[PDB]
């Protein structure tokens, strides 16, 4: 292959072979890997001799060691690694990984490691079920080619496709550029000039950087171990291997001993003139000399112009600067080494970083230290070097390719240098970098819950008993009663204070809460609580007192909390950005309702008016659930007519929207159905007589509590998202605002072809019409085709509204037409951006909300 057309044909045949090879099973790949490893191991000696003869550099014994490593250790590392099919499987979820192959790989082989790198890359390609093309260096081509053959035949003797390894017989710049542009992935090696072309070809690439590696020796180090390790690593393969130490920084305290140990074991220290001669010899015309790599110290000295003993192993020249101009501070693949003098550890760190930034940015660095007592220095070294491979007390040449001196390090050539060196791996290249992991996903569902306050006491006249329980099992000593001024002036809190004043409890009351409470009242209540420091909190008001008491509780237990941060909209309750603080250490919360249809005694919602702009912000979190819910009919037998009607209709809307909501389970379904039936059965009687019908009043309270639980566990919909804004803008009662919009939301939701759905996993398809049909069937209405039932339900709701004295349209409540029209455009946007809107099945748009508002106003 020395021209374009033959190269294209080779790519075609390699793609055909890879297509067949990609479907092999685990056993076939294991057999092929085993046979190829056997052949490569058995042919270790001749390959090294051929490489040394052709390249003209290196040591035959070290090349034998390298080939034996690249066969045996590579086989041992990935001997029983799964790279075929399903790897991870979690039955609880629906995740599954398949690990498909990658494709054809364009591998670049350097001239320093002709055969070992080829063997390693071919083996890891065969294990991963990929094809490979080898582009040999022009200086070592033949040797590299031979290596590939030693594998290829063995592979096809185990069952591999015939053309699964390919090579370029005569490499050239245009051929290499073209072959890089064709293969799916490039596995490059050879430093700058080739890695840049690999990363600038249009296909994903995996290259390697190279350069200087600094070795640090400090005061508390094993001198013999450090010196001998440095000599071993530097002399291994005449330093022609990458990651070999290029400079050593020795502190002032042990400079003499280190120098003596270096000269004792075959090192030649250079004087000034010899140092200058070596400077001129190493770097010529600002480039590395090609006649120096892989040569012995004696050969380098003879090239320089002086003579050294034949047993010399390393030439050491002491220098002072670490800049670019210093020729001893550059990379040199030869046994020439430079030694620096450092005063303290920080100076050594500065020199090391200056020497690694200019040269091998991202490559190896090594330190020698006593890692028993000098723990701080080791951490300082670790948190300083821009180094992917930091070595401690380890020779760098055998430590960079780490399976010899350290374990749990991936044994491989092709040392990745990460983003610092312009690479994308930052790790030893293994088999997991040659795989395409693809995931299989199955439809799951969100976890649901049923959370209710504990100790919900349900009986008439039970407030004495539940309040007496406060002293026996709990034994509290301070009480704070939060109410409104109306009930406090009319003596609705007399039984509670009478019960508390019977025994040893000191109680204080706060009654400055107006309807539609403001946040300033919350601050006042929190300040009073802090001044008094109570142990229990009691809310004895229907709608506003519970919200006020909850917000004072929040501001009292955690005064540093912020309202706007705490009143943010979210999508998932368990995935909200802001997490409510725990509230169980200071006070005990008790809720005693007086208005039926609010449900706030069992639910985590609370609405608060800003008073800065006038917007009713609702906030919700399960940390607001009271620890005690006491419902008693005794304090609810004296409600007015309009208030009773508003509360009843609000409870009915609560139940309907809880049943219809997307977050609906059997629990809330049963609760909502029971509440819906009991509200229709008893509301008119309670509205008419009131004081003379205790049974109706008790049933209404029970239904209100059931509905409260129902929507506490299943969030509401768009009817409240509209009613909140409608009642905030025009001072309408909440129940009245709910009454005027329910019969339009029912028609809005009941659509078999909605524009949008509510994007919830368990909401498979539009089913709201069927739910309304079930409601109509349970309430006791007749019809057919699942359409007349909804209409009869709407008619029944309209009749119920007519029975409780609620008018028909917005205009009946004296709302100016011009004022309505001028603010509808701004009210629609606020209605859409509400917490409840995200739970409605249909997810309304702005125009549809505006149309619903217009229909409500004009009838």
User: Cα–chain-centroid distance for residue 38?
Assistant: 44
Regarding 452 and contact with a copy of itself (CB under 8 A), the answer is: yes
Regarding 463 and contact with a copy of itself (CB under 8 A), the answer is: yes
Regarding 460 and contact with a copy of itself (CB under 8 A), the answer is: yes
Residues near 450 by beta carbon (within 8 Å), at least 6 away in sequence: 665, 667, 713
Selected range binding a copy of itself among 32-40, 359-367, 455-463, 849-857, rule: CB under 8 A? 455-463
Q: How far apart are CA 126 and CA 165, in angstroms?
A: 9
Q: Give me the helix-helix angle, 817-832 and 718-730, nearest 10°.
A: 140
Q: Tell me the closest approach of the beta carbon of residue 554 to a copy of itself, in angstroms.
A: 18
Give the number of other Cβ atoms within 10 Å of residue 301's Cβ. 23
Residues 210-269, interacting with a copy of itself (CB under 8 A): none
Give the number of other Cβ atoms within 10 Å of residue 547's Cβ. 25
Selected range binding a copy of itself among 169-177, 462-470, 787-795, 848-856, rule: CB under 8 A? 462-470
Residue whose CB is less far from a copy of itself, 417 or 663: 663
Regarding 462 and contact with a copy of itself (CB under 8 A), the answer is: yes
Selected range binding a copy of itself among 106-114, 359-367, 400-408, 698-706, rule: CB under 8 A? 698-706
Among the listed residues 177, 73, 180, 66, the one whose alpha carbon sits nearest the alpha carbon of residue 115: 66
Instruction: Choose the catalytic residue: 242, 417, 719, 836.
Output: 242
Residue whose CB is less far from a copy of itself, 702 or 835: 702
Q: Tell me the closest approach of the beta carbon of residue 550 to a copy of itself, in angstroms.
A: 18
Checking phi first, is residue 426 left (phi over 0); if not, alpha (psi -120 to 50) or beta? left
Regarding 859 and contact with a copy of itself (CB under 8 A), the answer is: no
Q: Tell me the closest approach of the beta carbon of residue 462 to a copy of itself, in angstroms.
A: 4
Checking phi first, is residue 690 left (phi over 0); if not, alpha (psi -120 to 50) or beta? left
Q: How far apart are CA 81 and CA 501, in angstroms?
A: 76
Residues near 674 by beta carbon (within 8 Å), at least 6 away in sequence: 703, 706
Q: Tell me the closest approach of the beta carbon of residue 461 to a copy of itself, in angstroms.
A: 5
The residue within the footprint of a copy of itself, chosen from 19, 81, 177, 446 (CB under 8 A), is: 446
The residue within the footprint of a copy of itself, chosen from 46, 305, 461, 581 (CB under 8 A), is: 461
Three-state DSSP class for 411? coil
Q: Tell me the closest approach of the beta carbon of residue 785 to a copy of itself, in angstroms.
A: 19
The residue within the footprint of a copy of itself, chosen from 72, 358, 427, 469 (CB under 8 A), is: 469
x/- binding map, residues 609-638, to a copy of itself, per CB under 8 A? -------------------------x----
User: Cα–chain-centroid distance for residue 71?
Assistant: 39
Checking phi first, is residue 461 left (phi over 0); if not, alpha (psi -120 to 50) or beta? left
The residue within the footprint of a copy of itself, chosen from 455, 747, 795, 807 (CB under 8 A), is: 455
Give the number of other Cβ atoms within 10 Å of residue 286's Cβ. 8
276 near 367, Cβ under 8 Å?
Answer: no
Checking phi first, is residue 60 left (phi over 0); if not, alpha (psi -120 to 50) or beta? alpha
Strands 95-97 and 89-90: what pairing?
Answer: antiparallel
Q: How far apart are CA 118 and CA 480, in angstroms?
A: 82
Residue whose CB is less far from a copy of itself, 338 or 629: 629
Regarding 466 and contact with a copy of itself (CB under 8 A), the answer is: yes
Regarding 302 and contact with a copy of itself (CB under 8 A), the answer is: no
User: Cα–chain-centroid distance for residue 676?
Assistant: 43
Residue whose CB is less far from a copy of itself, 167 or 715: 715
Selected range binding a copy of itself among 438-446, 607-615, 720-728, 742-750, rule: CB under 8 A? 438-446
x/- binding map, residues 471-500, to a copy of itself, per CB under 8 A? --x---------------------x-----
Residue whose CB is less far from a copy of itself, 175 or 629: 629
Q: Tell me the closest approach of the beta carbon of residue 457 to a copy of itself, in angstroms.
A: 5
Q: Tell me the closest approach of the beta carbon of residue 574 to a copy of itself, in angstroms.
A: 7
Give the number of other Cβ atoms within 10 Å of residue 101's Cβ. 20
Q: Tell me the closest approach of the beta carbon of residue 234 to a copy of itself, in angstroms.
A: 44
Residue whose CB is less far from a copy of itself, 591 or 706: 706
Residue whose CB is less far from a copy of itself, 461 or 614: 461
The residue within the footprint of a copy of itself, chosen from 260, 273, 438, 450 (CB under 8 A), is: 450
Residues 166-205, interacting with a copy of itself (CB under 8 A): none
703 near 636, Cβ under 8 Å?
Answer: no
Q: How far apart are CA 704 and CA 592, in angstroms?
A: 13
x/- binding map, residues 654-673, to a copy of itself, per CB under 8 A? -----------xxx-xxx-x
Residues near 164 by beta carbon (within 8 Å), at least 6 away in sequence: 14, 17, 18, 21, 126, 131, 132, 152, 155, 156
Q: How far apart are CA 352 and CA 375, in angstroms?
A: 19
Residue whose CB is less far from a copy of itself, 169 or 770: 770
Cα torsion for 641, 646, 647, 648, to the nearest 10°? 90
The residue within the footprint of a copy of itself, chosen from 12, 256, 264, 444 (CB under 8 A), is: 444
Regarding 457 and contact with a copy of itself (CB under 8 A), the answer is: yes
Q: Tell me the closest approach of the beta carbon of residue 673 to a copy of itself, in angstroms.
A: 7
Residues 557-586, interacting with a copy of itself (CB under 8 A): 574, 582
Backbone angles phi, psi at 149, to 5 degrees: -60, -45
Residue whose CB is less far from a copy of itself, 372 or 577: 577
Residue whose CB is less far from a copy of itself, 88 or 829: 88
Q: Tell me the closest approach of the beta carbon of residue 701 to a copy of itself, in angstroms.
A: 11
The residue within the footprint of a copy of itself, chosen from 42, 181, 438, 459 (CB under 8 A), is: 459
Among the listed residues 174, 145, 111, 132, the one whose alpha carbon sits nearest the alpha carbon of residue 21: 132
Residue whose CB is less far from a copy of itself, 622 or 858: 622
Total residues at interface with a copy of itself (CB under 8 A): 43
Residue 753 exposed, middle or buried by CB count within 10 Å (0-12, 13-18, 19+): exposed
Residue whose CB is less far from a copy of itself, 455 or 808: 455
242 carries an active-site annotation: yes
Three-state DSSP class for 650? helix
Q: Tell me the closest approach of the beta carbon of residue 447 to a copy of itself, in angstroms.
A: 4
Residue whose CB is less far from a copy of itself, 376 or 666: 666
Q: Tell me the closest approach of the beta carbon of residue 768 to a copy of itself, in angstroms.
A: 20
Regarding 465 and contact with a copy of itself (CB under 8 A), the answer is: yes
Largest CA distance in the chain: 123
Residues 63-122, interacting with a copy of itself (CB under 8 A): 91-93
Regarding 458 and contact with a copy of itself (CB under 8 A), the answer is: yes
Give the number of other Cβ atoms within 10 Å of residue 298's Cβ. 18
346-353 long-range Cβ contacts below 8 angstroms, 24+ apart = 348/216, 348/218, 348/249, 348/251, 349/380, 349/381, 349/384, 351/214, 351/249, 351/322, 352/214, 352/216, 352/249, 352/384, 352/385, 353/384, 353/385, 353/386
Q: How far apart are CA 739 and CA 687, in angstroms?
A: 15
Regarding 448 and contact with a copy of itself (CB under 8 A), the answer is: yes
Regarding 503 and contact with a copy of itself (CB under 8 A), the answer is: no
Q: Tell me the closest approach of the beta carbon of residue 642 to a copy of itself, in angstroms.
A: 26
Three-state DSSP class for 618? strand
Residues taking part in catalysis: 242
* List of residues contacting a copy of itself (CB under 8 A): 91-93, 444-452, 454-466, 469, 473, 495, 574, 582, 634, 665-667, 669-671, 673-674, 678, 702-703, 706
């Amino acid at each position: 292959i020395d021209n374009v057309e033959k190269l294209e044909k080779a790519l075609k045949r390699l793609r055909e072979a890879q297509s067949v090879y990609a479907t092999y099973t685990q056993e076939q790949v294991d057999k092929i890997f085993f046979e190829a490893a056997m052949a490569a191991n058995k042919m270790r000696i001749p390959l090294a001799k051929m490489a040394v003869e052709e390249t003209g550099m290196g040591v035959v014994e070290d090349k034998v060691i390298k080939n034996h490593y690249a066969s045996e250790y590579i086989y041992n590392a990935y001997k029983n690694t799964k790279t075929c099919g399903v790897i991870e499987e979690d039955p609880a979820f629906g995740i599954k990984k398949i690990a498909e192959p990658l494709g054809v790989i364009a591998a670049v082989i350097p001239t320093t490691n002709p055969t070992s790198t080829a063997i390693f890359k071919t083996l890891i390609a065969l294990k991963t079920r990929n094809a490979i093309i080898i582009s040999p260096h022009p200086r070592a081509k033949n040797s590299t080619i031979e290596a590939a053959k030693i594998v290829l035949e063995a592979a096809v003797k185990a069952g591999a496709p015939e053309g699964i390894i390919g090579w370029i017989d005569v490499p050239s710049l245009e051929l290499t550029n073209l072959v890089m542009r064709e293969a799916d992935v490039i596995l490059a090696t050879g430093g700058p000039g080739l890695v840049k072309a690999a990363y600038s070809s249009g296909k994903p690439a995996i290259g390697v950087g190279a350069g200087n590696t600094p070795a640090i020796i400090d005061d508390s180090a094993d001198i013999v171990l450090a010196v001998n390790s440095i000599i071993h690593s530097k002399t291994f393969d005449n330093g022609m291997i990458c990651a070999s130490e290029q400079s050593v920084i020795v502190l002032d305290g042990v400079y003499k001993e280190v120098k003596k140990e270096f000269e004792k074991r075959g090192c030649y220290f250079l004087n000034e003139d010899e140092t200058e001669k070596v400077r001129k010899t190493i770097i010529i015309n600002g480039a590395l000399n090609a006649k120096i790599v892989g040569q012995k110290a004696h050969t380098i000295a003879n090239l320089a112009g002086f003579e050294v003993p034949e047993t010399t192993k390393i030439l050491i020249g002491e220098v002072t600067s670490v800049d670019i101009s210093e020729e001893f501070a550059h990379e040199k693949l030869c046994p020439v080494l430079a030694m620096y003098r450092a005063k303290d550890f920080d100076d050594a760190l500065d020199k090391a970083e200056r020497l690694v930034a200019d040269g091998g940015f991202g490559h190896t660095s090594s330190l020698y230290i006593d890692t028993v007592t000098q723990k701080e220095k080791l951490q300082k070294f670790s948190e300083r070097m821009k180094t992917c491979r930091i070595l401690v007390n380890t020779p760098s040449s055998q430590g960079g390719i780490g399976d010899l001196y350290n374990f749990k390090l991936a044994p491989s050539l092709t040392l990745g240098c990460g983003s610092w060196g312009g690479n994308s791996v930052s790790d030893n290249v293994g088999v997991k970098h040659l795989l395409n992991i693809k995931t299989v996903a199955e439809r799951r569902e969100n976890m649901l819950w049923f959370r209710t306050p504990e100790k919900i006491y349900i009986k008439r006249g039970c407030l004495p008993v539940a309040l007496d329980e406060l002293k026996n099992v709990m034994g509290k000593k301070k009480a704070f009663i939060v109410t409104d001024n109306f009930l406090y002036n009319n003596g609705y809190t007399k039984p509670i204070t009478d019960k508390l004043d019977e025994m040893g409890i000191v109680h204080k009351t706060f009654f400055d809460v107006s309807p539609d409470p403001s946040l300033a009242s919350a601050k006042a209540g929190a300040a009073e609580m802090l001044a008094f420091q109570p142990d229990t909190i009691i809310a004895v008001g229907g709608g506003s007192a519970m919200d006020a008491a909850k917000i004072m509780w929040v501001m009292y237990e955690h005064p540093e909390v912020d309202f706007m941060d705490m009143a943010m909209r979210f999508m998932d309750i368990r995935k909200r950005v802001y997490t409510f603080p725990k509230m169980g250490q200071k006070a005990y919360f008790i809720a005693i309702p007086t208005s039926a249809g609010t449900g706030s005694e069992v639910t985590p919602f609370a609405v608060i008016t800003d008073e800065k702009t006038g917007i009713k912000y609702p906030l919700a979190d399960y940390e607001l659930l009271p620890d005690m819910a006491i419902v008693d009919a005794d304090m609810m037998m004296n409600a007015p007519k309009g208030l009773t009607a508003a509360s009843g209709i609000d409870a009915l809307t609560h139940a309907l929207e809880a049943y219809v909501s997307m977050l609906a389970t059997d629990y809330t379904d049963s609760l909502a159905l029971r509440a819906i039936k009991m509200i229709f059965e008893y509301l008119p009687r309670a509205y008419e007589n009131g004081a003379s019908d205790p049974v109706a009043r008790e049933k209404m309270a029970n239904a209100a509590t059931i509905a409260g639980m129902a929507f506490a566990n299943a969030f509401l919909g768009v009817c409240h998202s509209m009613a909140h804004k409608l009642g905030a803008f025009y001072h309408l009662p909440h129940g009245v605002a709910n009454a005027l919009m329910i019969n339009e939301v029912i028609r809005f939701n009941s659509s078999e072809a909605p524009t949008k759905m509510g994007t919830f996993p368990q909401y498979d398809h539009p089913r709201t019409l069927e739910r309304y049909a079930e409601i109509a069937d349970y309430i006791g209405l007749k019809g057919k085709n699942n359409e007349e039932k909804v209409e009869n339900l709407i008619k029944a709701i309209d009749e119920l509204k007519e029975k409780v004295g609620i008018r028909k349209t917005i205009k009946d409540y004296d709302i100016d037409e011009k004022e309505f029209l001028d603010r509808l455009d701004e009210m629609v946007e606020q209605a859409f951006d509400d917490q409840c809107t995200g739970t409605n099945p249909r997810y309304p748009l702005m125009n549809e909300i505006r149309q619903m508002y217009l229909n409500a106003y004009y009838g």
